[PDB]
């Protein structure tokens, strides 16, 4: 019973971006645009079922180049939503549908909300080479697109889950970074070694979900689920580091990630959503970190047996970005690092006599050496089985004070404000049901004046506006127990609900006493 | 070396038909289409079909009153054009082109064959 | 059916100036556009399609440029072998439509 600023889209919703006061949903077939303070739909935009032909590439006008008769509608489904602002500002959306490929959306000045005014399509053929397409960008099958501008120039390093049924026709990269071209009507991929793709041979046996990408320290970071080996059916977590110089992968290394429940040790081997943020101060001494450096937090779970599906059984680990790189640094020697074995083969020529060579932590070479390692970095849950019996699917993080808090949505559509700390009962001071479908990984946190902001949640076709403080307080119903709220929420008594000063716009707030009936 | 190789020149009188052949190689004869542009004296290029072996698909210029027939031989990897109806407007330098497929970017042409239509 | 437009009709220019054909079409075409180089005697010569990407083997000098209903050819320093007509061609729709030519003569 929480009336909150909320909005329903007819279509599951995917990814959701938040730029200049307005809010763009990239949902199954369509592009909505909210406003920020109410969430009231504002723009609309049909990306709707579209007929895919050979014969038709985008932009085109297919109903005159082809036969459309009897054709399948084939429903646009969201992949990528990314913004751009280092030239004229705009809005790069990637589908599902059309190989994959991207379009652009440009904004005017005098209305910065018109997305159906100017819509360029990002792709070119290459009648050259009838085998590559830079312009195919996303993979159906799931795919994370991280944007970032660097040397003056639009980069997109594109993570890619591969079946076996493209690689004949229709291929795809596992891993890989494009550069926008300065006309923006095309990528390019500057050389040989700008993509790193999981040899035929594997495209089945070995299959790579990519669940999260961020950079930070100058580094190319992205959160993964692979299979342990080769030959192993066990699934575990690798978080993946690579440094790009004019639009490269150097010094790509892959390093498994274990989050560990010593309560003999049970690990939870799959991540489902992760966030980067800076700690505050009692959790950022309590893992030997700095207030200013970027923590990786993530929330895991135990895979079914020999399976990469989770139970409903989590966890909740804490990986600071220092920490990390000091791990890939130090920790190499002449027994943990390894080739990777699904890139090249498991028996190649680089795979037995070549060495990382230490005269490097990001250098850029014509023949460059990409990496495994074999120890993992393994940290203990700091919710200590809290949440050992839910699945857990959303996580962000925001600080209030010198506390952490995270916030947290459930498989069953539970969402939960918690305060994060190693030393301290891990008490969810928050927790209600936003809806019956399960919470979606891809949220916003947002903030404004005095810590007092707010995160956007996604459920199936809703999202919802959730504020980051206050919430606590309003599933208190009587004064003496609006009273024993614990302190950071401050709470206080408004006449008959229980809000903080904040909310309490009329009459009388109390916080000091109460004076029950008998 | 990739190739398009046109028949030789022909003369007609107006109403007959002629057919124009075009026989490629170098390359997958489906993966491609093949389209067809004539260019009239004191005139530019028009455009006047294409065809996709692959699919059967055809499609002409409504200028041509449905004059036109294309068809493809894919075993032998050759494509042939026919003009029925001929009236002296049709007097032309007559040119085969290829393009990958939907793409209408034509790479590689034949040598084109010059068709005179007069009485 | 959908027109294309060139500009100039008939240009002159001397060797090493910068030439410059602008297209325009009739309908938002996206980046469907490709430019050809025509010699008496021999087929039209592909140089620039997709708008702006070139064609291996034509020298640096041959620049596109536009997008949706604008489009540009430009030529920075010209050479002898670079004299002939230049048509614009659409690849976005059928029925498929070139433009008038643009001839271009050197300069004495």
């Known amino acids: 019973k929480y009336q909150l600023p909320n909005f329903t889209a007819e279509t599951p919703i995917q990814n959701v971006i938040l730029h200049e006061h307005h809010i763009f949903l990239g949902a199954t077939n369509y592009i909505y645009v909210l406003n920020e303070e109410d969430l009231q739909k504002v723009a609309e935009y049909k990306t709707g079922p579209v007929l895919e032909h050979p014969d038709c590439f985008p932009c085109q006008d297919c109903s005159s180049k082809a036969n459309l008769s009897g054709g399948v509608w084939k429903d646009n489904i969201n992949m990528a939503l990314v913004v751009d602002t280092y030239y004229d500002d705009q809005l790069i959306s990637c589908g599902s549908v059309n190989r994959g490929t991207c379009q652009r959306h440009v904004f005017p000045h005098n209305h910065t909300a018109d997305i159906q005014s100017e819509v360029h399509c990002i792709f070119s053929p290459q009648i050259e080479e009838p085998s590559q397409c830079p312009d195919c960008v996303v993979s159906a099958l799931g795919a994370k697109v991280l944007s970032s501008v660097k040397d003056r120039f639009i980069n997109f390093f594109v993570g890619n889950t591969i079946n076996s049924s493209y690689f004949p026709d229709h291929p795809l990269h596992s891993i890989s970074v494009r550069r926008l071209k300065e006309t923006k009507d095309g990528f390019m991929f500057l050389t040989d070694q700008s993509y790193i793709d999981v040899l035929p041979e594997f495209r089945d046996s070995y299959p790579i979900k990519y669940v999260h990408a961020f950079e930070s320290n100058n580094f190319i970071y992205f959160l993964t689920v692979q299979r342990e080996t080769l030959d192993a059916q066990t699934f575990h977590t690798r978080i993946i580091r690579f440094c790009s110089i004019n639009s490269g992968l150097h010094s790509y290394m892959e390093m498994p990630l274990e989050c560990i429940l010593t309560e003999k040790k049970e690990v939870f081997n799959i991540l489902q959503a992760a966030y980067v943020s800076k700690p505050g101060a009692q959790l950022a001494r309590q893992i030997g970190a700095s207030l200013n450096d970027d923590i990786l937090f993530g929330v895991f779970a135990q895979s079914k047996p020999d399976s990469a599906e989770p139970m409903d059984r989590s966890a909740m680990c804490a990986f600071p970005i220092k920490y990390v790189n000091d791990f890939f640094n130090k920790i190499v020697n002449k027994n943990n690092v390894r080739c990777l074995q699904h890139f090249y083969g498991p028996n190649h020529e680089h795979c037995f006599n070549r060495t990382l060579l230490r005269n490097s932590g990001c250098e850029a070479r014509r023949d460059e050496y990409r990496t495994e390692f074999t120890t993992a970095l393994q940290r203990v849950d700091l919710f200590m089985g809290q949440f050992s019996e839910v699945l857990l699917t959303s996580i962000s993080t925001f600080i209030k004070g010198d506390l952490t808090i995270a916030n947290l949505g459930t498989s069953e559509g539970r969402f939960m404000q918690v305060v994060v700390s190693r030393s301290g009962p891990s008490t969810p001071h928050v927790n209600f049901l936003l809806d019956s479908h399960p919470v979606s990984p891809e949220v916003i946190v947002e903030h404004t004046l005095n810590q007092n902001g707010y995160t956007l949640v996604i459920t199936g076709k809703k999202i919802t506006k959730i504020p980051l403080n206050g919430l606590g307080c309003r599933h208190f119903q009587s004064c003496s127990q609006c009273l024993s709220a614990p302190p950071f929420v401050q709470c206080g008594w408004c006449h008959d609900k229980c809000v903080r000063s904040e909310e309490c716009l009329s009459g009388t707030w109390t916080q000091q006493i109460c004076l029950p009936a008998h | 070396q990739v190739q398009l190789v046109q028949s030789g020149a022909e003369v007609k009188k107006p109403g007959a038909s002629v057919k124009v052949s075009c026989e490629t190689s170098?390359?997958?004869?489906?993966?491609?289409?093949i389209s067809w542009v004539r260019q009239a004296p004191g005139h530019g290029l028009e455009w006047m079909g294409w065809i996709s072996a692959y699919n059967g698909y055809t499609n002409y210029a409504q200028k041509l009153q449905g004059r036109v027939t294309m068809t493809t031989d894919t075993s032998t990897s050759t494509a042939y054009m026919e003009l029925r109806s001929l009236r002296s407007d049709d007097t032309a330098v007559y040119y085969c082109a290829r393009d990958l497929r939907g793409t209408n970017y034509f790479d590689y042409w034949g040598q084109g064959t010059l068709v005179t239509v007069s009485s | 059916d959908i027109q294309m437009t060139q500009s100039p009709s008939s240009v002159s220019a001397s060797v090493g100036d910068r030439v410059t054909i602008t297209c325009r079409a009739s309908q938002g075409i996206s980046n469907w556009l490709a430019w050809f180089q025509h010699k008496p005697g021999k087929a039209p010569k592909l140089l620039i399609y997709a708008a702006s990407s070139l064609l291996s083997g034509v020298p640096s000098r041959f620049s596109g440029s536009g997008s949706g209903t604008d489009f540009t050819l430009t030529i920075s320093s010209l050479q002898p072998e670079d004299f002939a007509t230049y048509y614009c061609?659409?690849?976005?729709?059928?029925?498929?439509?070139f433009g008038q030519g643009t001839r271009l003569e050197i300069k004495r």
């Open positions: 061609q659409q690849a976005n729709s059928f029925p498929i439509t």
């Open positions: 170098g390359y997958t004869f489906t993966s491609y289409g």
